[PDB]
Amino acid sequence: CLPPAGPVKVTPDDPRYLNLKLRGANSRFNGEPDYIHLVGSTQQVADAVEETVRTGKRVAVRSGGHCFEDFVDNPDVKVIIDMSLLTEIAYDPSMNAFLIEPGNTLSEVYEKLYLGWNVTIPGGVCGGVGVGGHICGGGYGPLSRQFGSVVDYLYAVEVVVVNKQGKARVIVATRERDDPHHDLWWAHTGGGGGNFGVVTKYWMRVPEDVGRNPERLLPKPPATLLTSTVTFDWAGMTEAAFSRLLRNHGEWYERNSGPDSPYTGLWSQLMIGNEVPGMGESGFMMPIQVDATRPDARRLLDAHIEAVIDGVPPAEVPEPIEQRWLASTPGRGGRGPASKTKAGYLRKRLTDRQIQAVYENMTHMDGIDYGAVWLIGYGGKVNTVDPAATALPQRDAILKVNYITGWANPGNEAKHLTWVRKLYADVYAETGGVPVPNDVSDGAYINYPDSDLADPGLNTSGVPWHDLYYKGNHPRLRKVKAAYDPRNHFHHALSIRP
Amino acid sequence: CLPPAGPVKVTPDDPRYLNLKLRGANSRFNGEPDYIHLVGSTQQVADAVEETVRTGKRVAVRSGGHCFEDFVDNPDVKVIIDMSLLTEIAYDPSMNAFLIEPGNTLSEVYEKLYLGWNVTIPGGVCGGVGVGGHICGGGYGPLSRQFGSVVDYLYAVEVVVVNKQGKARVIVATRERDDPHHDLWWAHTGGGGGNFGVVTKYWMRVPEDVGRNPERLLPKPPATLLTSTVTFDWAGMTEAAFSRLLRNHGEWYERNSGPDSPYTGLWSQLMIGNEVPGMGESGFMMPIQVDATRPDARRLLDAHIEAVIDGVPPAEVPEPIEQRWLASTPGRGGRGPASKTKAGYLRKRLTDRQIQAVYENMTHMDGIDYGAVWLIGYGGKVNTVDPAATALPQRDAILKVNYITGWANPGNEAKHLTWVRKLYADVYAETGGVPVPNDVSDGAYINYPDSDLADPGLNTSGVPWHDLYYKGNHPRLRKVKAAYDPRNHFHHALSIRP
Numbered sequence: 001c002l003p004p005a006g007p008v009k010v011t012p013d014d015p016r017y018l019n020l021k022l023r024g025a026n027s028r029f030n031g032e033p034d035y036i037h038l039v040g041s042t043q044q045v046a047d048a049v050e051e052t053v054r055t056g057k058r059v060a061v062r063s064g065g066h067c068f069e070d071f072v073d074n075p076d077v078k079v080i081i082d083m084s085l086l087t088e089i090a091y092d093p094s095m096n097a098f099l100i101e102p103g104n105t106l107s108e109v110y111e112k113l114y115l116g117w118n119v120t121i122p123g124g125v126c127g128g129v130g131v132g133g134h135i136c137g138g139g140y141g142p143l144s145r146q147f148g149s150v151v152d153y154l155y156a157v158e159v160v161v162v163n164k165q166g167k168a169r170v171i172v173a174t175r176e177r178d179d180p181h182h183d184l185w186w187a188h189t190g191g192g193g194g195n196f197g198v199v200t201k202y203w204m205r206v207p208e209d210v211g212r213n214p215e216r217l218l219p220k221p222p223a224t225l226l227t228s229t230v231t232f233d234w235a236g237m238t239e240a241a242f243s244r245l246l247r248n249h250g251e252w253y254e255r256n257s258g259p260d261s262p263y264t265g266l267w268s269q270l271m272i273g274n275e276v277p278g279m280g281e282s283g284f285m286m287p288i289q290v291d292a293t294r295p296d297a298r299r300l301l302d303a304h305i306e307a308v309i310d311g312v313p314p315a316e317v318p319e320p321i322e323q324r325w326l327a328s329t330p331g332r333g334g335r336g337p338a339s340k341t342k343a344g345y346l347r348k349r350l351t352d353r354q355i356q357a358v359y360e361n362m363t364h365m366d367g368i369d370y371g372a373v374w375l376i377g378y379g380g381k382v383n384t385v386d387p388a389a390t391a392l393p394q395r396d397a398i399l400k401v402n403y404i405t406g407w408a409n410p411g412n413e414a415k416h417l418t419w420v421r422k423l424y425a426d427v428y429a430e431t432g433g434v435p436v437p438n439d440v441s442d443g444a445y446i447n448y449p450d451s452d453l454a455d456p457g458l459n460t461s462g463v464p465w466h467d468l469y470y471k472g473n474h475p476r477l478r479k480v481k482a483a484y485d486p487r488n489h490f491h492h493a494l495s496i497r498p
Numbered sequence: 499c500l501p502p503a504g505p506v507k508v509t510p511d512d513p514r515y516l517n518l519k520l521r522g523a524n525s526r527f528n529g530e531p532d533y534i535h536l537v538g539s540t541q542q543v544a545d546a547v548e549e550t551v552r553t554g555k556r557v558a559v560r561s562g563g564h565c566f567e568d569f570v571d572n573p574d575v576k577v578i579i580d581m582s583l584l585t586e587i588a589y590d591p592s593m594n595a596f597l598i599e600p601g602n603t604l605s606e607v608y609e610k611l612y613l614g615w616n617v618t619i620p621g622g623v624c625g626g627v628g629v630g631g632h633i634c635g636g637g638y639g640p641l642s643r644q645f646g647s648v649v650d651y652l653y654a655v656e657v658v659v660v661n662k663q664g665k666a667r668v669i670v671a672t673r674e675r676d677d678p679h680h681d682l683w684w685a686h687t688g689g690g691g692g693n694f695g696v697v698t699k700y701w702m703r704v705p706e707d708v709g710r711n712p713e714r715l716l717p718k719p720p721a722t723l724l725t726s727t728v729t730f731d732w733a734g735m736t737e738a739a740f741s742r743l744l745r746n747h748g749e750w751y752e753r754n755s756g757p758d759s760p761y762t763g764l765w766s767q768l769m770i771g772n773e774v775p776g777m778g779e780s781g782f783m784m785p786i787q788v789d790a791t792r793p794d795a796r797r798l799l800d801a802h803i804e805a806v807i808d809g810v811p812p813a814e815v816p817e818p819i820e821q822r823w824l825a826s827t828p829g830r831g832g833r834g835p836a837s838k839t840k841a842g843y844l845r846k847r848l849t850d851r852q853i854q855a856v857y858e859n860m861t862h863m864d865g866i867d868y869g870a871v872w873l874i875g876y877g878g879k880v881n882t883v884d885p886a887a888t889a890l891p892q893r894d895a896i897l898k899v900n901y902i903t904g905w906a907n908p909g910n911e912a913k914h915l916t917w918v919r920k921l922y923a924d925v926y927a928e929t930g931g932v933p934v935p936n937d938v939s940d941g942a943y944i945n946y947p948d949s950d951l952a953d954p955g956l957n958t959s960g961v962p963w964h965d966l967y968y969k970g971n972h973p974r975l976r977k978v979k980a981a982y983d984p985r986n987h988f989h990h991a992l993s994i995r996p
């Protein structure tokens with residue numbers, strides 16, 4: 001048993017500074033903090049937080065740096081509390097749950113959970129994403145249809161909070177109702193990070209009583225995944241062929257995203273993008289994976305493809321290769337390109353005029369390096385939980401839809417922004433440019449933040465940003481915010497305001 | 499301090515088996531063990547070793563799986579002890595040194611040592627190389643010319659050994675003179691892994707008394723590095739131009755590998771290979787890095803280049819890019835292609851007839867997917883230590899030469915093996931086809947093991963394999979081998995035998 005790495009205050013002249021300053025995934029955002037505070041223990045965080053209160057310096061937390069907005073990297077932020085050293089992944093006998101510290105990467109968590117106890121959490125696809133912001137934002141992934149969101153497995157949370165006088169306090173907030181700080185736990189079941197305080201620990205556990213046996217405490221990953229990726233050719237893709245595909249795909253998820261459907265083990269995202277000769281994971285492709293544990297795994301995959309590619313000429317279907325769980329270790333580089341992604345939920349399939357709006361903007365994209373629309377699979381075991389039981393209100397969705405643009409040169413930022421905002425405003429034109437909760441839309445997802453939803457120039461409808469993300473859960477979140485962060489010390493562009 | 503990850507005994511029907519079986523780097527080697535023993539603590543290691551004594555099963559340890567031989571992955575090995583869970587990197591006040599556990603990936607070690615204390619160890623370039631085999635095998639890297647080998651910083655080691663009755667015993671061996679197990683420490687200063695017992699902990703520390711301050715205990719890495727990669731075109735690479743280059747590069751390292759040399763902060767490996775259509779880090783190239791902390795880094799860089807590329811027409815020199823320490827460590831996958839690499843030391847430059855031999859074999863390479871001769875920069879601060887002081891005798895060399903082949907198809911192995919062995923036998927033709935300690939050669943390096951040297955067919959000289967690797971230090975290693983492994987429980991193709 002050893003002492004943790006002590007607190008290190010990384011000033012601009014210190015050689016580590018530039019590394020910690022630029023470790024954000026999105027290269028759009030550049031903050032110039034006074035110092036970056038590296039922490040190794042909960043107490044070090046408390047000492048860091050108190051100093052930011054005492055000095056009146058704007059503080060932001062960072063674990064993975066995979067924030068889509070400038071919540072960490074902006075001119076106004078003067079202190080970055082960097083959770084890089086807090087990387088513990090172990091079973092806690094005291095809590096009878098798995099302790100996952102914020103500074104861990106999803107790739108590092110899946111790795112340690114798999115080899116150690118043959119378990120996993122239904123988190124993000126990307127290996128490079130950090131735990132801290134991912135979980136309390138309501139993390140989901142390719143196993144979410146089979147197990148739910150990660151927040152459905154969040155038992156407890158250790159948070160550092162500031163009282164009105166300005167002093168730090170460490171609270172362990174649990175799931176149980178007899179806990180005095182039940183509200184604080186609930187705020188972290190998809191309430192988004194950078195609001196209530198600094199999370200120093202996550203405790204992950206299956207809600208049901210499975211005894212002290214640790215291998216039952218978290219979802220068991222499929223031993224093998226039966227994987228296939230369907231390619232589509234733009235050159236032969238007409239409007240009629242495009243409308244058919246999205247209708248086929250949308251309809252399939254309308255009737256196969258049930259909680260007790262045999263397609264809970266199947267996940268696929270339809271990636272509608274332009275082709276970049278060098279950039280991998282682009283173009284017009286549809287990665288599809290199914291749980292291969294069941295003997296009828298191949299039928300489920302085959303019945304999925306043919307329903308989607310029915311009457312769709314330009315489609316390429318290779319032979320489904322059965323690969324093991326974590327056969328190839330992820331971690332898509334470090335510093336990514338400058339990008340802007342806008343998000344929306346789907347209860348039903350995209351309307352025919354929305355599909356038309358997608359095709360129009362995908363056809364008209366001159367001077368765009370990368371521009372895509374992804375239709376990520378959702379629902380299933382997610383839609384068993386009450387909209388109010390967790391901080392995530394969207395317990396009705398079948399698809400998550402993202403609108404992405406990327407660019408190599410910062411000079412063309414405005415050029416790309418216009419296109420992705422034109423795409424977004426054309427699709428949700430009938431509901432004031434934004435996915436207002438409807439029979440089709442259900443709102444937005446806080447792990448995909450969009451500061452345009454708070455801007456009056458980009459959100460023409462009267463519906464505010466916080467109603468789009470939180471819906472009926474919003475009034476409760478302000479109640480938590482005012483209780484645990486009355487000084488409003490933790491804030492950003494899309495922070496909860498009392 | 500939560501209890502360590504429990505001992506999981508991975509049987510063949512277990513979903514984890516194939517992942518843990520195939521996590522070796524070189525895909526030429528396969529093995530079918532009865533079980534793979536994952537361990538979380540030193541006690542779990544000792545218990546696993548005793549079980550293999552009781553069952554009589556042949557055992558092999560694994561950290562990063564980056565063995566260039568069949569030491570871990572061979573049909574005879576029935577138990578793998580996997581150290582993946584033992585990944586601790588913290589400051590140890592008891593030893594006043596840095597505790598680094600074997601299961602750690604090198605990339606992770608530099609990352610945590612840099613962030614936590616602004617320190618580093620002068621070890622390997624490759625990211626996914628495990629600490630376990632690396633340090634006890636006399637690990638080296640770019641900073642070795644300025645700091646020496648990693649073994650020059652090895653203060654202590656925790657080893658699990660077996661007495662002749664078959665019982666496990668945990669021993670902590672230190673650098674100190676009075677230590678009753680000084681020999682066991684010396685055994686791990688370049689003696690190679692898989693010999694004396696299972697290494698469960700390393701302790702890294704500067705020899706000088708620097709006090710209790712952790713920031714002083716290890717070398718502080720350069721803040722920034724000045725980098726350049728000189729490309730060479732095979733199209734204009736005649737025999738005269740080739741001989742000129744290797745003579746220039748050879749003679750430069752003859753004059754500039756002194757411990758007092760200003761070029762101790764400069765490192766360059768000459769990669770003489772064929773350009774593989776779709777695979778980076780191959781072809782005819784020469785990456786050069788220099789410590790940008792020095793006031794004349796650019797004057798030293800260009801001086802090194804102009805001397806090497808002197809009278810070499812197809813040399814292509816780019817503009818030098820300055821990048822910070824650990825600016826980006828991407829990680830080039832996990833499972834690499836099947837390769838066979840043969841190594842050797844160089845005290846002086848390759849003779850004209852040896853350069854002739856290289857050019858001859860680099861011209862004629864039909865069916866060869868990849869084939870290269872690497873001349874890795876060495877010496878400098880390494881050469882300060884006495885040959886007998888550590889287990890590494892070669893404290894005189896200026897370069898480390900590697901002879902590498904690579905194939906994509908398992909069928910084409912025999913063809914590739916013939917060519918690389920032809921290359922090796924052609925270069926060392928005067929001294930029995932091996933680098934017998936000479937005016938030029940100085941044996942081989944143990945972290946690049948070569949079982950061909952123990953083979954009487956491929957090694958046709960009156961010099962055995964161990965005299966090449968260990969030289970004068972071999973007799974003493976046999977003594978330590980007999981003292982701490984009398985049963986010879988830990989053995990492979992190139993293990994120390996009494």
Ligand SMILES: *Cc1cc2c(nc3c(=O)[nH]c(=O)nc-3n2C[C@H](O)[C@H](O)[C@H](O)COP(=O)(O)OP(=O)(O)OC[C@H]2O[C@@H](n3cnc4c(N)ncnc43)[C@H](O)[C@@H]2O)c(*)c1C
Nearest residue numbers: 561562563564565569622623624628630631638691692697
């Ligand atoms: C694949 C690879 C290797 C490299 C590369 N570049 C290097 C460099 O730039 N400098 C170097 O000094 N070395 C470089 N190497 C070679 C590696 O350093 C060696 O091949 C190491 O031996 C690798 O160690 P490891 O990752 O642990 O490989 P394993 O197969 O796990 O172990 C090898 C050997 O070690 C024995 N052993 C004894 N005790 C232990 C413990 N406690 N833990 C692990 N292993 C132990 C094993 O029995 C086995 O025989 C660049 C690249 C791409």
Ligand SMILES: Cc1cc2nc3c(=O)[nH]c(=O)nc-3n(C[C@H](O)[C@H](O)[C@H](O)COP(=O)(O)OP(=O)(O)OC[C@H]3O[C@@H](n4cnc5c(N)ncnc54)[C@H](O)[C@@H]3O)c2cc1C
Nearest residue numbers: 062063064065066067071124125130132133140193194199
């Ligand atoms: C390439 C990429 C791929 C992605 N893939 C997926 C995916 O597959 N599935 C999915 O659901 N999401 C995905 N996301 C979105 C991701 O889940 C969110 O952006 C998440 O908030 C990232 O958190 P982080 O800690 O890694 O990054 P950060 O920027 O460190 O965290 C974001 C926010 O968390 C706040 N925060 C508050 N407390 C803490 C704390 N204790 N530790 C850390 N941060 C804290 C920070 O202040 C910041 O505002 C992806 C994002 C990227 C960039």
